[PDB]
From a paper:
[name] (TS) catalyzes the reversible conversion of the inexpensive maltose into trehalose in the absence of any coenzyme. In the present study, we have determined crystal structures of the wild type and the N253A mutant of TS from [name] (DrTS) that reveal a closed conformation for intramolecular isomerization.
The four or eight subunits in each asymmetric unit did not display significant differences, with root-mean-square deviations of 0.3–0.4 Å for all Cα atoms. In the wild-type structure, a similar Tris signal was also observed. Because of high structural homology, in particular similar active-site architectures and subdomain B orientations of TS to SH, AS and SI, we therefore conclude that the MsTS and MtTS structures may represent an open conformation of apo TS, while our DrTS–Tris complex represents a substrate-induced closed conformation for catalysis of the intramolecular isomerization. In particular, Arg148 forms salt bridges with Glu223 and Glu324, which form hydrogen bonds to Gln254 and Asn253, respectively. In addition, Asp153 forms two hydrogen bonds to Asn347. In DrTS, Ile150, Phe151 and Phe173 in subdomain B and His318, Asp319, Glu320 and Glu324 in S7 all constitute part of the active-site pocket. This means that interactions of the substrate with these residues would bring these two subdomains closer together to form a closed conformation.
Residue numbers in the entry:
A (entry chain A), B (entry chain B): 6 to 553
Write the structure that this text describes.
Amino acid sequence: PEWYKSAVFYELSVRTFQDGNGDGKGDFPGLTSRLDYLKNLGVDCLWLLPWFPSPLRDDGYDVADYRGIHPDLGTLDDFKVFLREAHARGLWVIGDLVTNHTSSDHPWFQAARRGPTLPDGSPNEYHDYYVWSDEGKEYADTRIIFTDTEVSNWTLDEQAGKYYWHRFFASQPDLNYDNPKVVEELHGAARFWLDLGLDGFRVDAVPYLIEREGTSCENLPETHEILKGFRAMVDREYPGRLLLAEANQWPEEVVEYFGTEAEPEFHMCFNFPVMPRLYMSLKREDTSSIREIMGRLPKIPSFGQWCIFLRNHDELTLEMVTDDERAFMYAAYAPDARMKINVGIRRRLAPLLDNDRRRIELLNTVLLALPGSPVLYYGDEIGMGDDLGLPDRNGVRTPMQWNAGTSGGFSTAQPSDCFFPPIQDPVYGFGRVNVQSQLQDPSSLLKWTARQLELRRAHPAFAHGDLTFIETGNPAILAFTRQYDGETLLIVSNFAGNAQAGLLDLAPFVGRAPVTLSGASPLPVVTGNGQYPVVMGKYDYYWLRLNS
Amino acid sequence: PEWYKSAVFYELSVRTFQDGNGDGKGDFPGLTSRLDYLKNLGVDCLWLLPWFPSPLRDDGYDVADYRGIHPDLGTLDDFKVFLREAHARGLWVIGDLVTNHTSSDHPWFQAARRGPTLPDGSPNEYHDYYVWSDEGKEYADTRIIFTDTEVSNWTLDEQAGKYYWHRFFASQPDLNYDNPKVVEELHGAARFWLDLGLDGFRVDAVPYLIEREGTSCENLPETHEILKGFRAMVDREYPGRLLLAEANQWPEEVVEYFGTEAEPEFHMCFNFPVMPRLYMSLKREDTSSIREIMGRLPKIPSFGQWCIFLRNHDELTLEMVTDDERAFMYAAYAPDARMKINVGIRRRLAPLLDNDRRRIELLNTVLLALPGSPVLYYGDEIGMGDDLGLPDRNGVRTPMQWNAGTSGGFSTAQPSDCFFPPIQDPVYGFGRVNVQSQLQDPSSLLKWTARQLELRRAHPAFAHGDLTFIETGNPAILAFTRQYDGETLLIVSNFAGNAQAGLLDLAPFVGRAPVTLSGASPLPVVTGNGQYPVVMGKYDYYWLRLNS
Ligand SMILES: [Ca+2]
Ligand SMILES: [Ca+2]
Ligand SMILES: [Mg+2]
Ligand SMILES: [Mg+2]
């Protein structure tokens, strides 16, 4: 019933998607010119990365003005026409709300570092917007997220003569959520955009808002309380809008970000826990880690929906796996040391899978078949690669590859003048991987993706169904049912690189006939004790309905 | 065994493969520079299209000098070094021997058209090298092969004042094999090349040598007798050399080109009969035509070996199928009328299969898994397309696509200066489809092909085994065994575009365990009555061994 539950999401970065004025930077007019492509793909909601004024030290997640549009992306008018046109096509759009911190170039912080009092005796009302310390000795049981860059979560400010807190880069000072004026400022920022018609927000780094002595400073009850506040505001003032949480934590802690029926928080949260186990299972040819980790996720509220994903603008995060699992992933998916960043792996989806289309298809089917609303990362529809020559996580944020012309069609500016260089290598470069090609190619990955979303869209049980794992007698083979409104789907997936045999426990479905979702080819009726023998080719996916 | 039985063949055209001197024309030095690529691919024998002097009215199959090298391709020295280097790498090489006719520019024909007697009263000894008629009324129960171009197999020569015979173009007059001088001329031509160390010949258009009143003028006993003469000569003078027949006929008539143990003809013949049924079965999702047509092929001599192929330098021939089968193929594989030529379809393999890699892989596995020695058509290993803007069958003979540089790496001459233009379209063009890319791409089609030939090479039962079709209870699924030297291979192939179920009749193999040839994953042991249930994903191939 709520729109987000049946939507397909698409994550993109305006500066990196389409340049409309030849300066090497993506912009809103450019994005707007590509809306037909997104609609045709089968996308329903666009999630745009931060578009606000910013020195871009963390690519826009260091925000310097919550109520504007970064100059290189265009103007606020350009934004309003973009939104009009998106809505004209039946697309929703959500922004990225950066709550935990601002840029050090935010006027607030420039004001705040003047000290507790102005030179004229008056109180500096902005000073307590941020989190200050005399010695930087507090919150010591606290981990560092940007392990490769920051040595400490406290940094000394020259002119303020005190240490300030930051969970991310030193140029991203944390906001102080014990100060109620800060809560107002952000309720107000969100309002500004929701008043223009924005359909919601992806909310950034939600676990880290409140910090408390003698705790990890993650997932604190007071942090959750503030988030309940946001949801309460939106429910009252902007019914129907979406709030989606970036909360990368273990299952028990992630689910709490939905809140409860009585005290709601987020409508949606990313399913961070399943994501690594997908990759792990593929290398191990053993899907048990998927069932285990999915099994640890409690039921969610009635309004709740998972956002399922494979990759995104960040590294493949390994922060919320065991030390053994982390080491395995590095060994398997980060052979070069240059591939690691801050407890994670900074590679695009296709390279991670050795550009093996069968493996790419497989994981995409799992993405679309698990319970939640799926999100695609821009460029993965065509099999884009990465560029590890770029610092930080920018190697997975190269320009979208539209055609084989100048700079992949992203801009008329030459490749070395683009904000990030478009990829030109013989395997993943825009000469070989681009939209124009794949639109004309009857069997391209783009076309496959669209066809597969069409298929999903035609079976609501994917969006809304329950989930029940089936025993297969072979850990390489992952089987489950999705049931909803009388419909029973059976999804069988082979994570091995060669043919595999299984014995499915279909005892609950004796007497019923499985048929392929695609073309209704019938398989043998389920008989006897219901132990159903199968064979599967390498990386096969069987999308079935059980007819009664 | 004989070398040809375990060889993998590769068909290529020198003018079109690699240019070494920037004139837009492929040549021998160029070819020689690409021998490592062919060896590494897993090729054993190169079959070169005609390399002889010629006006190229049928792309070199109109021969004007049997004992030379066409100037565009280089010199006779260039040839000798090419051969030495091929042999240095353990590669065999065969040429194309054009027996049935010559160019009208051949000195023989220039001499012959002077008439039976010279202007000085002397007899013209060359006049009877060709086949002449006063009225062109003879051999009227005879079909026309180039239906789109030729209205008659007789053509009036201006200066000779008589009609001459030609099964092919009017510029390709048939040689007269009732004149024994002609037989000597060609025994001699073959000798010239075999003396240089050439390992054999593909022999062109063998059914059409002798023509007789009141017959079809195809497959005549006197034609076969002459071919026995060629074989006899090579067996005596050049033991170990290969003779491979182009004989496109129905099963009963093709097999006769092997001759018998007592009177041998050809070592190898192309398996023309199976080829169309492969394509048909895929569209119909019903493999019965393959079993039917394979079933009609009699056993062949001990020295005999089939040459299995999917495509070649000609059209996809529909001359030897039923009228109903022909109409179906046109409907399914020739939607544009421009795609038909002379009772066939002039398209490359990948375009025929909608560039669907799964379908490409499938047919390739079948090519490699049927009994015979397989032949690859140059460029199909990377998924090359075609150019229907070129006349006749030249649209499948575009330059090999080596890299994304100038003219696909085929030449430094620009694309409009190449002999045939290298393909530039967004789907199949050299920017997207080339060797360099696929060598660097871990999961490319090139790499797949090589990996799959490796796999074949490791199981001699593919080359030498018998063949037995297995009952599957589903026409979409084609199963068979190949047995040799105690080894039993089981090959199961799905020709449907969605998942299929089968029940394999493995009664003869109760108690034995099928394992994947690739990685030895075991499947359930064959039990009970031996009726073995399977499921297959779309276009899957299962390559299995049955272990005792
Ligand atoms: Ca904080
Ligand atoms: Ca003849
Ligand atoms: Mg711009
Ligand atoms: Mg040349």
